[PDB]
Design an enzyme around this catalytic site. Structure first.
Site, PDB file in Angstrom:
ATOM      1  CG  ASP A  78      -3.232   4.773  -2.246  1.00 20.21           C
ATOM      2  OD1 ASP A  78      -2.654   3.653  -2.040  1.00 20.21           O
ATOM      3  OD2 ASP A  78      -4.292   5.480  -1.449  1.00 20.21           O
ATOM      4  CG  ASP A  97      -1.594   1.339   1.384  1.00 18.04           C
ATOM      5  OD1 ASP A  97      -1.773   2.130   0.205  1.00 18.04           O
ATOM      6  OD2 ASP A  97      -2.325   1.423   2.558  1.00 18.04           O
TER       7      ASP A  97
END
Ligand SMILES: [Cl-]
Ligand SMILES: [Cl-]
Ligand SMILES: [Cl-]
Ligand SMILES: [Cl-]
Ligand SMILES: [Cl-]
Ligand SMILES: [Cl-]
Ligand SMILES: [Cl-]
Ligand SMILES: [Cl-]
Ligand SMILES: [Cl-]
Ligand SMILES: [Cl-]
Ligand SMILES: [Cl-]
Ligand SMILES: [Cl-]
Ligand SMILES: [Cl-]
Ligand SMILES: [Cl-]
Ligand SMILES: [Cl-]
Lengths: 323, 323
Positions: free
Chosen positions: A216, A34
């Site tokens: 992201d 992440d």
């Protein structure tokens, strides 16, 4: 100084995830790699929540190398939260052996947010300034101990199939066409940079005069400020349904506009196919509004189209057209 | 985490130099802060050459913190050479105290190259890959021990006067107008980057299709490959004299072309005033040919016009119009 190839999997509308190991002997987990966060955590035996019941749980009793630090860890993901306690153990990511790595062992994961997620835990790959107190990001340990060949990692997301790949310490030109373009990171916390404009047929429909954006891997959609996203939902012909989702007619892709992000003087077009997700006989917009922020989030919708290199040595993001 | 303001001096056609201290108690030296090299050395009592006789010599017998390493150091500067022996001592650069710093104590500086130079020694500020064996660059020690506020330094060269300044760990917007533009370093050894083209009135006169260049405070002139520099010497109306120097008529500045370097999409013009040096009733070209290289050297001629920031954290060079 090694390279790790971590195959990434995704099911339907799920996030992308891959395998890591924790403890001695190694215990297997799936994690969300992440770039929108910096902490590392997995479920543990001390978590009784439904979500933990549905996932692999770390058993420190079976690891000869575990050490509890006792420090709390709290994180948010989507609308959900995880509460846990930090400890040290050895993380193995294929080639790479990362000893004495801080890791959160969850204690509380209430609600359904994590229950139906495909991954067990989260391995954040953003900057240390985003890490919680007492937490050291995995990739920072890898870099500081010279465990990786180069201080960068590359992410390929397969728009159509199952060849997605996270590469620690290397760039694979086989996953892209043309050349990588390098974009300076403006603010070192998220992988953040300046977007110059968003256009359709040369007309600015969003990000007038420039905006901040992050890249992201832990977000599915392309997120922007309300008024800009409105322009876009209208232009692509997306309309709200009862679930609050913006639906797109799958058979209209051929007539829809191409939405182009200009970043550092280069064009990153998103075709109707790219920004439209087809999770059934229903297609939905890959664009989403946020109300309390003007910072864009370029999630999986974008990354699926553009092979992404995250370079800590030079504080750059590399983008190239994905194969 | 401190800042050092090092005033730089220059006399006539000399290089720019400033003061550092070495030893305990501190002994004063003038050094060439040289982004074109990475070693640090000063003359020592063990050097009997004429050049050493004309400069400050480090006396380790008077320093309680000196330690000889015994390892040879050899460097080239201009057509001259220095031979010396590496040791450790404490370097002080205003605010900053850099203990156990490798430093060459010269033993041989034959010939007149160093004799008539204004500086005593050289403090290289390029990358460690350019350092000689056993040598650790001063700024790298400063960074690694977090002695500087930020991992960068800035150089202002006063085209007209005596306000030149080297700043360790900070950028001073008072030395420039407009904004800094950041240029990626291509090869981390010198401060090297890509020049896109060199033009006069939009016509490419050099660096057709792009070339490599370095930004080098330890070189006076702007150096390029033979054929390109020829185009330029002809265009600016420079002609060779008996000394092999290219002379320019001082009274013709008003009629001469502006030579523009394009770097990363931005223009860096050099006016006739900028590229013409007036060291008397004689003006000379600031351009110079090299025969065994295609890599440009942007020396003091360029830096005098463009305030220069050297950023190790991000591997960038920053350029802005100098006040
Ligand atoms: Cl998921
Ligand atoms: Cl940070
Ligand atoms: Cl690296
Ligand atoms: Cl590579
Ligand atoms: Cl750039
Ligand atoms: Cl902005
Ligand atoms: Cl808004
Ligand atoms: Cl399409
Ligand atoms: Cl000199
Ligand atoms: Cl290096
Ligand atoms: Cl820094
Ligand atoms: Cl500053
Ligand atoms: Cl080139
Ligand atoms: Cl040539
Ligand atoms: Cl002029």
């Amino acid at each position: 100084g090694e390279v790790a190839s971590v195959p990434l999997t995704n099911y339907l509308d799920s996030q992308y995830f891959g395998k890591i190991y924790l403890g001695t002997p190694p215990q297997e987990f799936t994690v969300l790699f992440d770039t929108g966060s910096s902490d590392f955590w997995v479920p543990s035996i001390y978590c009784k929540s439904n979500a933990c019941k549905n996932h692999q749980r770390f058993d420190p009793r079976k690891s000869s190398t575990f050490q509890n630090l006792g420090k709390p860890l709290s994180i948010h993901y989507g609308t959900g939260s995880m509460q846990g306690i930090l400890g040290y153990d050895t993380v193995t990511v294929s080639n790479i052996v990362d000893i004495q790595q801080t890791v959160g062992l969850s204690t509380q994961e209430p609600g359904d947010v994590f229950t139906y997620a495909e991954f067990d835990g989260i391995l954040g790959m953003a900057y240390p300034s985003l890490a919680s107190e007492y937490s050291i990001p995995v990739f920072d340990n890898m870099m500081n101990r010279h465990l990786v060949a180069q201080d960068l990692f590359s992410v390929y997301m397969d728009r159509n199939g199952q060849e997605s790949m996270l590469t620690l310490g290397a760039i694979d030109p086989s996953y892209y066409t043309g050349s990588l373009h390098w974009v300076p990171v403006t603010v070192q916390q998220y992988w953040q940079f300046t977007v110059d404009s968003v256009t359709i047929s040369g007309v600015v429909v969003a990000c007038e005069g420039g905006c901040q954006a992050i890249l992201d891997t832990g977000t599915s959609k392309l997120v922007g400020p309300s008024s800009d996203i409105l322009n876009i939902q209208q232009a692509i012909g997306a309309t709200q349904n009862q679930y609050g989702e913006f639906d797109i007619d799958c058979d209209n892709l051929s007539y829809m506009p191409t939405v182009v992000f200009e970043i550092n003087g280069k064009m990153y077009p998103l075709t109707p196919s790219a920004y439209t997700s087809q999770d059934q006989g229903f297609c939905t917009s890959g664009f989403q509004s946020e109300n309390h922020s003007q910072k864009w989030i370029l999630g999986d919708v974008f990354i699926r189209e553009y092979y992404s290199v995250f370079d800590r040595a030079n504080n750059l993001v590399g983008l190239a057209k994905a194969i």
